[PDB]
Design a protein around this ligand. Structure first.
Ligand SMILES: OC[C@@H]1O[C@@H](OC[C@@H]2O[C@@H](OC[C@@H]3O[C@@H](OC[C@@H]4O[C@@H](OC[C@@H]5O[C@@H](O)[C@H](O)[C@H]5O)[C@H](O)[C@H]4O)[C@H](O)[C@H]3O)[C@H](O)[C@H]2O)[C@H](O)[C@H]1O
Ligand SMILES: [Ca+2]
Ligand SMILES: [Ca+2]
Length: 803
């Protein structure tokens, strides 16, 4: 572990270098710095105001733009939306004391998917504070007086700077295309005006590129002295038919509501290309955020990919095949017996890049955020080096930067066995994973694919696979999993498809097989109650073959059979037999499967005596709420029930149950509902230590089906995929045994899942019926609310669905 990292969360980072310091400015007024692109240190205070670091009094300072969006309005209601900034030292800028030189920050304020604007502020010193100057591109404005939900900002186009731009003849007047017919904004062809990128060209002229989804990316020339756009003035098309707009500029990528934002464009002189980066898809874990690359010889476009396809989309089409997919979801998955520990290094939804191009050395760096597998929306910044391949395309390193650099590489150090990921073009929540190949000394590639390779010169890599020639480089990289510097390669085909390779360490088949044994564990095989996951592959296509000493206890796949209540617990032996080549090893596990034990009835509110009593004796009676759990003022009638009399919930009332009704992680609930109507989220059985710690049995959940639901730290979706009938009785129940949760309907298991929260032990919880904190009370009758200490047996539940 020579190298050493120090992480931060900065979302949509724009890299910039002051003196010998690196700096990244992100959305939500986050910023951090580094000497090494490795250890980062945050120096902002987020949205704190005043004494906000970057702005001081955020609200007065930037009031120019909050008038239009980003402060306490529509989607920004209750806070601020200051997004996706870009910073750069502008030496030619004239400050307001008439001196020259200033760090400029362009930012986005947005209050809906379309009503946004770009503004900018200046400081003389990179760390701040920056001071408002002007708000300069707007989107989402209407033809006539219009307002958004939770806003009283006249959206009409006369609230924008456009009036004044026309006043100055910077425009001849309003374009009718900006509006649809109802007069709403034409975000099919015109941009959401966020995600600014400022760049210089071949001659050090300055441009702003911007846009996100909606009509796509435009670019505008900028006045180097005042930082204002030199607006086109006229509509038209460019020679290749791309849109030019008097105000928005020249469309250079995207279109027709399709994804694509986070634009960053870089002039490279060593090749004379304008490299355009843009990030496709949605930013969240399930959105498949992925970075794309094109290039143009002119800053103004046309920008095209490795296949010469336009960045600008022809219609409202899948954008998948456009641009070079240089990075998306991937995972060098640890299989059993791989060194290191845990799942392996991979990213999820990596995107919104910026790039730094060290002027003296040609060295290049991709800087971006990514989420990670099994981390949810948690995000850190990452930095991957990039190297100009032989076709004028920078190719992106597989691992984050760790001091490495381009090198004279010897052939022996390449030859070997690799992990190989292929990024493709497609993008979704799906994660791309490795195959195993080897690069043989006779310049062939064998294993999970077949083909050829060469190393030209010191480092240039040629790889050719079922006709596809990928061009890039070879280079050493830090592998956190093995904790070593490993040889590696990254390379682009003429489809604009990247493949990445990491070298595995030489290892005899004997060696591998013993490694796999050593890593093969099954956890607790002494108190076994549910099926065991028997892995069938180890590292490097190692076959793990499983036999059983008794398939009545457990199958070769790990299907267990719990003996009956009151039966002895049963034993058996599983034999892993691990094989690579002719090498083999053998690890055994002795298993014990436990019989069912009967869960034990602890409270029963039958309502059978026109009262709220617990016929077990164990608990005090229920008492009556209003429409919420912590209020009062309701009525409970007692109508005829599924079994004797039932409670009546009239939509206004609910029932409060003793705190600590449940107090374990080994418990169960049964009850019978006949619902008169169905309101989303409205609970039946509600249990809660507090409003971020609760469990709720819901007839029509967020998916519109019945479901057992738990939130907010963490959420957990017990989805039945089954819809309750009104005006009819339906028996419900659920088990919880230390982590394990099942849910039954009308006797039948509809959900089984795992890792369910322990919400009723380490304090004391409130409990209720039909009411909660937030949603309509329950309408109708609830019957035979039985509560148990133990996880109910499947047979016990079919007894319950019976009468
Ligand atoms: O009394 C004043 C209130 O108390 C405080 O409550 C804290 C918040 O409320 C709790 O949630 C209650 C719950 O949320 C409402 O619906 C909104 C849902 O949020 C989304 O959650 C994500 C989903 O979870 C998974 O199933 C799946 O991954 C996602 O689809 C969900 O999609 C929305 O439907 C509803 O009204 C109510 O039942 C939380 O614990 C906490 O955040 C507040 O200060 C105040 O309001
Ligand atoms: Ca950006
Ligand atoms: Ca009853």
């Amino acid at each position: 572990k020579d190298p050493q990292f120090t992480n931060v969360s900065v979302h949509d980072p724009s890299i910039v270098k002051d003196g010998d310091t690196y700096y990244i400015f992100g959305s939500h007024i986050e910023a951090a710095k580094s000497k090494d692109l490795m250890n980062w240190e945050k120096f902002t205070n987020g949205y704190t105001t005043p004494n906000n670091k970057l702005y001081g009094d955020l609200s007065k300072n930037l009031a120019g733009s909050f008038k239009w969006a980003g402060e306490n309005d529509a989607d920004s209601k209750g806070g601020f939306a200051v997004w996706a900034p870009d910073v750069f030292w502008n030496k030619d800028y004239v400050n307001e004391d008439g001196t020259k030189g200033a760090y400029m920050i362009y930012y986005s304020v947005s209050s809906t998917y379309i009503r946004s604007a770009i503004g900018y502020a200046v400081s003389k010193h990179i760390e701040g504070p920056y001071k408002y100057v002007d708000t300069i591109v707007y989107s989402g404005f209407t033809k006539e007086e219009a307002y958004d939900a939770n806003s009283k900002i006249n959206k009409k186009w006369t609230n924008t700077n456009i009036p004044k731009l026309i006043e100055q003849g910077k425009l001849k007047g309003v374009r009718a295309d900006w509006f649809h017919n109802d007069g709403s904004y034409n975000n099919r062809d015109f941009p959401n005006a966020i995600d600014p990128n400022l760049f210089y060209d071949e001659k050090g002229n300055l441009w702003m590129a911007y846009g996100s989804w909606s009509g796509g990316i435009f670019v505008l020339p900028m006045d180097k002295t005042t930082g204002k756009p030199i607006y086109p003035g006229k509509d038209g098309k460019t020679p290749d038919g791309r849109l030019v707009d008097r105000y928005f500029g020249i469309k250079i990528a995207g279109g027709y509501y399709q994804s694509g934002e986070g634009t960053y464009i870089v002039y490279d002189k060593n090749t004379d290309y304008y490299y355009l980066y843009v990030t496709y898809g949605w930013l969240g874990a399930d959105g498949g955020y992925n970075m794309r690359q094109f290039r143009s010889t002119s800053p103004t476009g046309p920008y095209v990919d490795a296949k010469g396809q336009s960045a600008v989309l022809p219609g409202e089409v899948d954008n998948s095949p456009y641009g070079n997919k240089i990075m998306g979801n991937f995972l060098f998955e640890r299989k059993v017996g791989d060194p290191g520990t845990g799942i392996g290094v991979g990213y999820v939804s990596p995107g919104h890049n910026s790039v730094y191009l060290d002027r003296k050395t040609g060295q290049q760096f991709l800087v971006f955020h990514t989420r990670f597998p099994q981390s949810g929306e948690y995000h850190e910044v990452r930095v991957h080096q990039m190297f100009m391949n032989k076709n004028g395309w920078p190719v992106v390193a597989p691992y984050r930067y760790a001091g490495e650099k381009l090198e004279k590489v010897n052939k022996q150090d390449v030859v070997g066995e690799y992990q190989l990921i292929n990024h493709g073009k497609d993008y979704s929540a799906d994660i791309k994973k490795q195959i195993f190949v080897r690069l043989n000394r006779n310049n062939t590639i064998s294993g999970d694919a077949t083909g050829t390779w060469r190393k030209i010169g010191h480092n240039q890599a040629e790889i050719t696979i079922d006709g596809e020639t990928y061009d890039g480089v070879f280079v050493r990289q830090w592998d956190p999993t093995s904790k070593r510097y490993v040889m590696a390669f990254t390379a682009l085909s003429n489809e604009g498809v990247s493949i990445w390779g990491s070298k595995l360490a030489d290892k005899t088949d004997e060696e591998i097989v013993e490694d796999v044994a050593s890593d093969l564990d099954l956890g607790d095989t002494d108190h076994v109650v549910s099926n065991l996951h028997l892995p069938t592959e180890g590292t490097r296509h190692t076959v793990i073959s499983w036999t059983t000493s008794d398939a009545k206890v457990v199958s070769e796949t790990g299907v267990v059979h719990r003996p009956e209540v009151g039966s002895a617990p049963v034993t058996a032996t599983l034999t892993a037999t691990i094989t690579k080549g002719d090498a083999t090893a053998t690890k055994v596990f002795h298993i014990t499967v436990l019989p069912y034990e009967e869960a034990k009835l602890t409270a029963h509110y039958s309502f059978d005596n026109n009262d709220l009593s617990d016929s077990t004796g164990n608990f005090g009676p229920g008492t009556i709420t209003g429409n919420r759990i912590d209020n009062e003022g309701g009525t409970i009638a007692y109508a005829d029930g599924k079994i004797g009399k039932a409670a009546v919930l009239n939509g206004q009332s609910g029932i409060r149950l003793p705190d600590g009704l449940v107090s374990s992680n080994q418990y169960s609930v049964s009850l019978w509902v006949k619902p008169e109507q169905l309101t989303t989220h409205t609970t039946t059985f509600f249990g809660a230590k507090d409003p971020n710690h609760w469990i709720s049995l819901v007839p029509q959940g967020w998916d519109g089906n019945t479901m057992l639901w738990s939130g907010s730290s963490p959420w957990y979706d017990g989805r039945t995929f089954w819809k309750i009938p009104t005006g009819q009785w339906t028996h419900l129940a659920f088990s919880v045994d230390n982590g394990a949760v099942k849910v039954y309907i009308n006797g039948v298991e509809k959900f089984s899942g795992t890792n369910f929260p322990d919400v009723f032990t380490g304090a004391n919880a409130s409990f209720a019926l039909g009411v909660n904190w937030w949603d309509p009370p329950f309408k109708g009758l609830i019957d035979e609310l039985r509560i148990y200490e133990g996880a109910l047996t499947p047979s016990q539940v079919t007894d319950l669905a019976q009468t």
